[PDB]
């Protein structure tokens, strides 16, 4: 009316600033996407000359002389064809077969079921002008292969992560197994020890009761945004633990940690940044809490020798 009618004008001026501001940020983004689309008319490339020494997996290779950490070819079993993998031969006596690796966000992890089944990403890359690929790329080996390796015999799992401030903690599991596809790659872990927090077996430290329990991954089934096999038993298509862009993991209701989450730059991220407000992203609540995305995350396995 009298003075309240003064808000209206100052108000129009505000929104006017925003709506015309955003309309520009959009222009910016559009420009940005068109550029990247052009850079994608051609791919990135690698030249990974294969090492001579080979074996069923990294442990056998290091016992056969392979002492350098790089890409190796392994034939777990004679039925299946040999495949490339990265071997960590330095970390804790080496002989670690890397099955999962995050470090820079170069690879997409929010994929469907089939790709998590076959594997995806870049295993290795060429190091400072060298004919062999000595550094690991970001990748998921593939459920089938992981299931086969862990079953070959007693297998232990080493999970490593780093925050955006340089800190590092580890998660060790003396026993680790992943069943085959018919069993929805059901996971089983045990004999923990570390500094990262036993998120897989216990659940989120920040939670209490049935909540700290429904975040337990041990014994869970594997799910991808296009294949629900989680702990949420309902018909509400809005409660599933893995939504579009989200990664495949051993979700319950829903998680304590998710090494396969979206790679948020910087670390801290909020609900209004996440595609669904849900908190996807390389999480491990037991150490950095709920809305923090690691800078480095990796999963390594090694035959367990008492």
């Amino acid at each position: 009316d009298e003075t309240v009618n003064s808000n209206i004008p100052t108000n129009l001026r505000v929104l006017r600033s925003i709506l015309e501001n955003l309309r520009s940020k959009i222009q910016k983004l559009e420009s940005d996407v068109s550029a990247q689309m052009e850079y994608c008319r051609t791919p990135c490339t690698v030249s990974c000359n294969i090492p001579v020494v080979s074996g069923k997996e990294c442990e056998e290779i290091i016992r056969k002389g392979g002492e350098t950490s790089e890409m190796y070819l392994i034939q777990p079993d004679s039925s299946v064809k040999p495949y490339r993998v990265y071997c960590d031969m330095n970390t804790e006596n080496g002989g670690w077969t890397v099955i999962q690796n995050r470090q820079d966000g170069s690879v997409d992890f929010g994929r469907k079921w089939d790709p998590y089944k076959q594997g995806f990403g870049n295993v290795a890359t060429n190091t400072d002008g060298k004919n062999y690929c000595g550094l690991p790329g970001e990748y998921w080996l593939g459920n089938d292969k992981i299931s086969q390796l862990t079953r070959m015999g007693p297998t232990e799992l080493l999970i490593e992560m780093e925050d955006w401030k340089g800190d590092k903690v580890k998660a060790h599991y003396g026993g680790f197994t992943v069943q085959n596809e018919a069993n929805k790659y059901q996971i089983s872990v045990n004999k923990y020890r570390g500094t990262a927090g036993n998120a897989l077996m216990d659940g989120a430290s920040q939670l209490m009761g049935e909540n700290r329990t429904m975040t337990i991954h041990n014994g869970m089934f594997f799910s991808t945004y296009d294949r629900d096999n989680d702990g949420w038993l309902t018909s509400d298509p809005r409660k599933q633990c893995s939504k579009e862009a989200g990664g495949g993991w051993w979700y319950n209701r829903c998680h304590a940690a998710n090494p396969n989450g979206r790679y948020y730059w910087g670390g801290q991220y909020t609900w209004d940044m996440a595609k669904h407000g849900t908190d996807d992203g390389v999480v491990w609540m037991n150490w950095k809490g709920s809305w923090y995305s690691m800078r480095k995350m990796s999963m390594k396995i090694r035959p367990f020798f008492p």
Partner: protein, 298 residues
Amino acid sequence: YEASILTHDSSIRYLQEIYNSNNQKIVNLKEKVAQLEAQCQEPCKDTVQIHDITGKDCQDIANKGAKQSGLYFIKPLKANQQFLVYCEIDGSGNGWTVFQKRLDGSVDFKKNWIQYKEGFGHLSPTGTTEFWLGNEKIHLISTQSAIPYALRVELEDWNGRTSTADYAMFKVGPEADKYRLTYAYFAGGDAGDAFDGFDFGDDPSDKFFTSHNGMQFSTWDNDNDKFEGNCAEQDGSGWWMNKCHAGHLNGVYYQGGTYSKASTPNGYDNGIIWATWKTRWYSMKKTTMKIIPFNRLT
């Protein structure tokens, strides 16, 4: 400065025109984004690939159709698992399985028994890498049920000059016999039969002390030489040592090829030498050792 309260209806109806417009563009953008995500699921293209064609050895494969050098998977009849190798296929259609390679010194050859048994170094589609296939593999290949094999030794100096030494009925034994090297006879070659021995003049037994036919393989951690001391160790390598050598392809890689006695705290002649061709103080610039069924060697 706050205008007419009558413009508000158009002004208000204006922010809406640029609001829905914004939402519109955002939708197309998201579509554009969907398309981008599609062009970013693939992995970097690896130049180095392996052919599918397999066989008992490079020849078996070459015959099957393969026509270009490159990495392949072979499985000799008696082998447990199959293993990758570097096949060389010429125009005449001869599949040479290479098991030793030198060309830059990037790969250290001062390795132990196991490593020399299992193999070390890297395989490359363009045969531009150094390696040792592995005594066990070489053994398997050269002792396939009733198949005489032939070993060709190719050298090259720091002047673009090459030479070759061929050996008929090449064979390498099993670990039980320390991968003993053996052959029927020097099948010729301008490189020279360095395996038969070489007279230096240091001793009256030189020839005897430097012959390689029949010699077992040695590494510092597994002395099998004909010397009261350790050949493989002194030279710092793995090889069929006698006392010690006349032909030694797994030697230290001396850049320039020319080295002397003042090259070590003992004056050892531990380089890539082959007495019949150049002097013992000349380490080759390149070295390749390949085999192929004798019944094919012209």
